Amino acid sequence: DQQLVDQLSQLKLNVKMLDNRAGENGVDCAALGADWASCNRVLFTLSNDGQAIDGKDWVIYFHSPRQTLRVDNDQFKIAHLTGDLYKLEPTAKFSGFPAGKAVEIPVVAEYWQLFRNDFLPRWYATSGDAKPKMLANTDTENLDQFVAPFTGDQWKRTKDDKNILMTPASRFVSNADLQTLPAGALRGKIVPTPMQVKVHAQDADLRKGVALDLSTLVKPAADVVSQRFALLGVPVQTNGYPIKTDIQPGKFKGAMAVSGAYELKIGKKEAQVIGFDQAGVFYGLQSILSLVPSDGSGKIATLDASDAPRFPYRGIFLDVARNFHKKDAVLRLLDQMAAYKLNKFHFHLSDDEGWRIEIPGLPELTEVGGQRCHDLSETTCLLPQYGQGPDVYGGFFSRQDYIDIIKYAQARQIEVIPEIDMPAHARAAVVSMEARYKKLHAAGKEQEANEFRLVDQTDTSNTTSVQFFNRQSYLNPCLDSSQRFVDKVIGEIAQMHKEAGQPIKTWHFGGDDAKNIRLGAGYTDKAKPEPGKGIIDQSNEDKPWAKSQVCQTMIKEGKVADMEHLPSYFGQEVSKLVKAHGIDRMQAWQDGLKDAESSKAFATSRVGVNFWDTLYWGGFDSVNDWANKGYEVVVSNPDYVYMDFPYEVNPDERGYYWGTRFSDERKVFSFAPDNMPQNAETSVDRDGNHFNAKSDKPWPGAYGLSAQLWSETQRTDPQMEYMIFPRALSVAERSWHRAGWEQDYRAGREYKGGETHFVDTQALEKDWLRFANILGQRELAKLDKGGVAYRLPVPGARVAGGKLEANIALPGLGIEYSTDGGKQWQRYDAKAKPAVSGEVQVRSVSPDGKRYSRAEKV
Amino acid sequence: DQQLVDQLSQLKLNVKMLDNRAGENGVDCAALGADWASCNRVLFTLSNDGQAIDGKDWVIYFHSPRQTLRVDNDQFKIAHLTGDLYKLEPTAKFSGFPAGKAVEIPVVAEYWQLFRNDFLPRWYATSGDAKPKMLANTDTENLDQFVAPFTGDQWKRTKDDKNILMTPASRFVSNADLQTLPAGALRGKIVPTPMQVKVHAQDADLRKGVALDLSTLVKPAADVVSQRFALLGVPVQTNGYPIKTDIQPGKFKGAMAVSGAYELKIGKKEAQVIGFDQAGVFYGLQSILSLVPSDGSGKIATLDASDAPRFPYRGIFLDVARNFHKKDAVLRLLDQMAAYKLNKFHFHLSDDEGWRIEIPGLPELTEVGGQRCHDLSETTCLLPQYGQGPDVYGGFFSRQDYIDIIKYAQARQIEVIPEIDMPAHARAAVVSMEARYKKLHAAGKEQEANEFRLVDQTDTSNTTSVQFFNRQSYLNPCLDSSQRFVDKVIGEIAQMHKEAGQPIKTWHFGGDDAKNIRLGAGYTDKAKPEPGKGIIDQSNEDKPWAKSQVCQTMIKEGKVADMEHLPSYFGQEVSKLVKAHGIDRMQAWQDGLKDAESSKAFATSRVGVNFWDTLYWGGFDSVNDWANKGYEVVVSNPDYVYMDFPYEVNPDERGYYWGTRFSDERKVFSFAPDNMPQNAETSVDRDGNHFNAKSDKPWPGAYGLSAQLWSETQRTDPQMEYMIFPRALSVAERSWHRAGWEQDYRAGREYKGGETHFVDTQALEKDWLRFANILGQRELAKLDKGGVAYRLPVPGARVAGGKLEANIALPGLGIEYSTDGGKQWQRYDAKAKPAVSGEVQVRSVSPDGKRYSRAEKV
Ligand SMILES: CC(=O)N[C@@H]1[C@@H](O)[C@H](O[C@@H]2O[C@H](CO)[C@@H](O)[C@H](O)[C@H]2NC(C)=O)[C@@H](CO)O[C@H]1O
Ligand SMILES: CC(=O)N[C@@H]1[C@@H](O)[C@H](O[C@@H]2O[C@H](CO)[C@@H](O)[C@H](O)[C@H]2NC(C)=O)[C@@H](CO)O[C@H]1O
């Protein structure tokens, strides 16, 4: 009853890692079904400072990105509902949570949990009809309230892991090749780096303001330029320093003859920007603005520059489905996209755990799919996921919100590409359409109920998704109604785009992970188990839709070859719907189209692919085929440009880490997207080891680059902003500019990590040093002004001769230190280092002085 | 002597633009007499690869549409004879064209020359009685032989010109909102668009042939239908698919109750066409034929349609006076008129430079007026014009030819409207009648000599025509003999029409530009010159006929009010002659009638006007009056439907460009002729700027639409066909069908270019996309079959990721590309784009594979 739920809610949880390599130590992970026989032991402690809790009628729900495989306290048992949701219950031996006691519930989980962020907040209790309530100490974003600190080598994935744990002492080393450059060395350095520039000795003085000739721009775009001059402190006045603009495509030749190219002249008393188009004009103005200094001095260098994108497509992907992010945070994201010349906003509007766009005619998508709450019938919500609590969680963009966002992107030369992921990652839609079927069906409106249904009523398929949902994650690709559903959604979102003044140019089909993970190579069958693999029963495991009779007659009449091809078939069918709606480009996660013959198989004359294999796994050689078969390769490698991954190897950092252990500003910047093999000389793999890479195939070139912010653990908007900024500026640099150290692709060249020296690493490091200093001494101050909660790097620090030496990944940032356990903080000065003894803590501070990095002991 | 003329003939000419905005740069265009003080500098280079040419007894003649104002090599001087003819001579300082030298003769010309086609071929030399010979390298239609390529921004008219120069890179952008539609989306789409249609899923199969019931048509018209089925590949056989026809006016109601309306049913095994009249029947059959696919498949969609003209009058105007065009090209023009349902052929049979119809009783009109040759007495020819060479150039339709043409038009439901332009644009007639006067006078037959004379022997008027002729361009409107002349010509052409089975319904009086251009606002007087205008002597400038004593006593007895009214007076007098000949409709260029009170002033019960002001100059508001005064407005705006204007802004395109810089297929299609103000939201003005338009007056409606092919630079028949086709299909569409995006006229509505969004531009663009694809994938192949040398658009192209992307203004057309400087060409494939590096050239190819667009570098 409620009293029992109230008691449970007052238990205090403690989660503590016990062994991240249990399989290296005596646990038979394989016998427990663990993938590749890897499992970890963790201790859940429930402390009860109240009277005894002896009732038995209860369930405690909790979330985890890892499956629980065993429970080592025979008073309790754990089972899975679906996705990340698990329930903890009392067994027949349960004898209560004793008054004033701590109950220990050790468990084994699949894989490893190397970051404290793996442990999700908001555990909650239930009991017969009572209302659910969270375990209070878990209702927080501060992991310290319920997750113990990692100790020793708990961060290691395996005994041979060569990653380097970042602490002030090792971080100091990681940062020691850097230094702070004098203002005099950072004159006339536009970001992103322009193709050709010549800086002269004088400076244009803007502090009295500028007279902007913006007749080349449509009003909304001009206002964006005017309002940015003001944000950076430069008045706009008719008697100010002249900045002229003109559009003359012909002035441009060859590779410069493309959207966004411009010529820019900065003189002593006037400015000139000649663009290839409005985008070029806008971008030229952005370059002038990138020069505006953070000191308010309003002085910029005179210079002569010529510039154009190395790629058409310079994108940022944002997941709002896993955890919603508000309109104001999308807008702050676009404002920064425009300032650094990104032009593509890939909007992941749906996935298993949420549907975020209102669709006229399909209200259930948002009424049910837009919120998650504790309802086991999933008639009014999706089941809770991601540690947001049992009560309603969600939101969605209304038609007007969405239209506003597109208008807002258009003003900033940013194209919005909507993604409605299918045929997997579609649980929100499938469950919403099931609620719709039922409602309509209950009124006897059987044709209306079936109109947009995404399930085949005979489908008993047993399939497990990558995030542990079941068949409800997969929209059936063989139903006419599924096609009716996709056609209606495309038609509705297409109209919103038209109303917003930016008709859709690319429809993103999604298409990732449409497979049963239990059929994977790291799992084996109970009957004849092979070694080192998770032992499961594969007798009743099936590919997706195997048991859909509709998908059977589909394959019989010969429309499709086999169950295996359903996903590409569906990608081709959607391309027809996309084309039927007047859109001539489709894009997808490359694995959904991997069974098509080539791009010739699609109805749109252009098919792009977000290439997301990792390099160390053959991605530097498998990407070639994608281009060679006619697809436009948007490079999206998870080992470099997945912004949901950690900035550094430290158990207190936020981020998933399946494709690599970290990707900081420097690593992103050092990625060479158009000569993938070369990354073997400039980066290490997921376990910190050197790797080799070589391809012998033709490589015509990439079409673009895209950095992704998946949102599983980015539960809030500030957390989203921390993960995107400031490493997105690196993305922007690399998406716009081809550096000199980025070598031409050479078939047959074999780059061997720690062995070959083909890459001009000296040039790479000098380039990075300058970029890092531009961020520290000028751009981060602009981020402060845009209000985005970017991550401030923790300082590196060492004590020599009894004096603090500190450094930072983005030279120019202020560094503070404390000699009192963080009670009083003081400004560290390089040329007058302080004397310390005992425990010293260090932290960095934003340029406007309001925010601090986390604090760490030296 | 001949040797000198032979030497000159071997000089090689080079013409190269030096500055198209000389007045913006230091030249005092106003001081040189340039209109609105605008002038340009051009370099004429004469290279001599032979021995020295030192004789002085020579003249070199050349043509230009611009007047030469200054000569910057003091060895030479240039003067005007009349019209476009100029002579280049040696001055007293001439010292010969040195052996193996290039002589440079820089000159200043009035206005600007933005297209290489402005420079005319066929310069020629003369010397005492020797025979004239051309400068050989100029004897060609290939401008590259003597006209240098334009460079930089030489295409700009003024420093602020906002037109967009079309190159493969910018053209790619202009074309990027388009795409190719699958055959499945182009089923049952008749062109022009029918008023009401419903297409069903099956297709009628005609590949075995059709059984045509054509008893509703007079034989000549039925043969036209039969022969078109065969041209398109569909056999005609008694056992073929039935196509029935019937004529029942009553089945039609309201707006459908008009000539050319029809009901059409296309079923699985039979066809039905019910017309309001023979024209409707014929048109219904044309719609079935428009559906016949270019692949020979003979499959058309079943459908049910109802259709009628939005306007009675759907015309095509053709100038054969400036440059003649043969009977076979008129016939190919009519065949296409019929296929797209145009029913009016406005035939400009005369003008200053040629008279093209044999008139019994007036042989000189064709013996002298039908040819141009170098004869300074103009006793056997008119003076050479338009770069056709010094030797005889011309031709004319014999009475039988002309009768044939009318019979041919009648068979195709096309009405021939003859125009004999007057009182200006009549030099051919005036000079021919002067030769007649003289001949007859020499035999002493003084009454015969004066019978049809068009000059008053006392007339010393000094007037300059728009094309720079003098008083001989103006027929005297005050002479009884001029009226005898017009009466005889009407009587003779009227009889030819009767003999051909199509009695004249409209007589076109012409009436354009009857004024002295030196009295214009852009010129000023030497005594007190105002700024920015061409400074000339206006003391002895007079209106036309001011100095004709006959026109003085005419004005005295009070028959006419003043010199200024002579032109409308003449329009009224001709209307009486037209009516006296049994014709009850007169038509004219609206400016000749602008001084009549209203239509009440004419003798015919109907008076039409070809309205030819431009919109950006108040035409969207001045047209109202024309309708409001009783005139039938035939919309003919030069800013949209003058087919002598360029298809695109590119110095290598053919076309005059006074009213606008370009009018491509898309622009013509987008013109809204019955709500003129709306064009301000859908087009830009002559300098590429937005414009506004609004009227507050009553607008009852237009009577029809007409697209004009003036022929100054259409020297050959293939050039005529290039300029008319394929944009005439757009004209046809807009003349027949009122689109949904064509809004009702709203008094007081103010459309503001780039500011108001009243027009459903999305609907406009979708309509155009479909139309463009019908042309690319089906209709252009039919043009190939009719043998008309239509213009093939140059592809747009860009290189991304090192691969060619190409598009085209008429999707469906094949695109080729070369990576060897145009030596080897290969087929471009959208879904398997090619990899290129270096110079790439692109070109399009007709559907039958025999012809190519020009080639351009990417
Ligand atoms: C807990 C964990 O790390 N699971 C991995 C999945 O997150 C991962 O999925 C892909 O990566 C994103 C997160 O970085 C997911 O949000 C996204 O849905 C998914 N798809 C793409 C295109 O990235 C998979 C990939 O194999 O690995 C799991 O192990
Ligand atoms: C060289 C030039 O562009 N001159 C213009 C004349 O061509 C033009 O005349 C009118 O336009 C037609 C050509 O497009 C002429 O062939 C036709 O005789 C004449 N009349 C009509 C009814 O169009 C005049 C118009 O003002 O402008 C000159 O500037």
CSV table of N, CA, C and O and ligand atoms in Angstrom, one decimal, chain B residues 65-66 319 322 351 425 466-467 512-513 589 612 642 644-645 656-658 710 712, ligand 2:
chain,number,residue,atom,x,y,z
B,65,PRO,N,23.6,48.0,-84.5
B,65,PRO,CA,22.4,48.5,-83.9
B,65,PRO,C,22.6,49.7,-83.0
B,65,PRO,O,21.7,50.4,-82.5
B,66,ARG,N,23.8,50.1,-82.9
B,66,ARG,CA,24.2,51.2,-82.1
B,66,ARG,C,25.0,52.3,-82.9
B,66,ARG,O,25.8,52.0,-83.8
B,319,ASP,N,8.0,38.4,-87.6
B,319,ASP,CA,8.6,39.4,-88.4
B,319,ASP,C,9.4,38.7,-89.5
B,319,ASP,O,10.5,38.1,-89.3
B,322,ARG,N,12.5,42.2,-91.4
B,322,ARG,CA,13.8,42.6,-91.0
B,322,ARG,C,14.8,41.5,-91.7
B,322,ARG,O,15.8,42.0,-92.3
B,351,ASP,N,8.3,46.3,-93.3
B,351,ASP,CA,8.9,47.2,-92.3
B,351,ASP,C,9.9,48.0,-93.0
B,351,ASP,O,9.7,48.2,-94.3
B,425,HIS,N,7.7,52.8,-89.7
B,425,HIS,CA,8.2,51.5,-90.1
B,425,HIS,C,7.8,51.2,-91.5
B,425,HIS,O,7.5,50.0,-91.8
B,466,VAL,N,13.2,55.2,-84.7
B,466,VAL,CA,13.9,54.5,-83.6
B,466,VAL,C,15.1,53.7,-84.1
B,466,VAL,O,15.9,53.3,-83.2
B,467,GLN,N,15.1,53.2,-85.3
B,467,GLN,CA,16.2,52.4,-85.8
B,467,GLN,C,17.2,53.2,-86.7
B,467,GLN,O,18.0,52.7,-87.4
B,512,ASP,N,3.3,51.6,-84.6
B,512,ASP,CA,4.3,51.8,-83.6
B,512,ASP,C,5.4,52.7,-84.0
B,512,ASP,O,5.9,52.9,-85.1
B,513,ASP,N,5.8,53.5,-83.0
B,513,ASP,CA,6.9,54.4,-83.0
B,513,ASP,C,6.9,55.5,-84.0
B,513,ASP,O,7.9,55.8,-84.6
B,589,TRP,N,-0.4,48.4,-82.7
B,589,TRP,CA,0.5,48.6,-81.6
B,589,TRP,C,-0.2,49.8,-80.8
B,589,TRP,O,-0.4,50.8,-81.4
B,612,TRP,N,2.1,46.8,-75.7
B,612,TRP,CA,3.6,46.5,-75.5
B,612,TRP,C,4.4,47.4,-74.7
B,612,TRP,O,5.6,47.4,-75.0
B,642,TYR,N,8.6,38.6,-75.6
B,642,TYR,CA,9.3,39.0,-76.8
B,642,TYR,C,10.3,37.9,-77.0
B,642,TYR,O,11.2,37.8,-76.1
B,644,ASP,N,12.5,37.5,-79.3
B,644,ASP,CA,13.7,38.0,-79.9
B,644,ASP,C,14.7,38.3,-78.7
B,644,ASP,O,15.8,38.9,-79.0
B,645,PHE,N,14.2,38.2,-77.5
B,645,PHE,CA,15.1,38.4,-76.3
B,645,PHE,C,15.7,37.1,-75.9
B,645,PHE,O,15.5,36.0,-76.3
B,656,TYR,N,17.9,40.6,-78.9
B,656,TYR,CA,17.9,42.0,-78.5
B,656,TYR,C,17.6,41.9,-77.0
B,656,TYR,O,17.2,40.8,-76.6
B,657,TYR,N,17.6,43.0,-76.3
B,657,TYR,CA,17.3,43.0,-74.8
B,657,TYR,C,16.9,44.3,-74.2
B,657,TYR,O,17.3,44.6,-73.1
B,658,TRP,N,16.3,45.1,-75.0
B,658,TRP,CA,15.9,46.5,-74.5
B,658,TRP,C,14.8,46.4,-73.5
B,658,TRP,O,14.9,47.2,-72.5
B,710,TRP,N,10.5,39.1,-83.4
B,710,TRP,CA,11.0,40.2,-84.2
B,710,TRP,C,12.3,39.6,-84.8
B,710,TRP,O,12.9,38.8,-84.1
B,712,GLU,N,15.5,41.1,-86.2
B,712,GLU,CA,16.8,41.8,-86.5
B,712,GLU,C,18.0,40.9,-86.5
B,712,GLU,O,18.7,41.0,-87.5
C,2,LIG,C1,18.7,48.1,-80.6
C,2,LIG,C2,17.4,48.1,-79.8
C,2,LIG,O1,17.3,47.3,-78.9
C,2,LIG,N1,16.5,48.9,-80.2
C,2,LIG,C3,15.1,48.9,-79.6
C,2,LIG,C4,14.1,48.6,-80.7
C,2,LIG,O2,14.3,47.3,-81.2
C,2,LIG,C5,12.7,48.6,-80.0
C,2,LIG,O3,11.7,48.4,-81.0
C,2,LIG,C6,10.5,47.6,-81.0
C,2,LIG,O4,11.0,46.3,-80.6
C,2,LIG,C7,11.3,45.3,-81.5
C,2,LIG,C8,12.6,44.6,-81.2
C,2,LIG,O5,12.5,44.0,-79.9
C,2,LIG,C9,11.5,46.0,-82.9
C,2,LIG,O6,11.9,45.0,-83.8
C,2,LIG,C10,10.1,46.7,-83.3
C,2,LIG,O7,10.3,47.3,-84.5
C,2,LIG,C11,9.7,47.7,-82.3
C,2,LIG,N2,8.2,47.7,-82.1
C,2,LIG,C12,7.5,47.0,-81.3
C,2,LIG,C13,6.0,47.1,-81.4
C,2,LIG,O8,8.1,46.2,-80.6
C,2,LIG,C14,12.5,50.0,-79.3
C,2,LIG,C15,11.2,50.1,-78.5
C,2,LIG,O9,11.2,51.2,-77.7
C,2,LIG,O10,13.5,50.2,-78.4
C,2,LIG,C16,14.8,50.3,-79.1
C,2,LIG,O11,15.4,50.9,-78.2
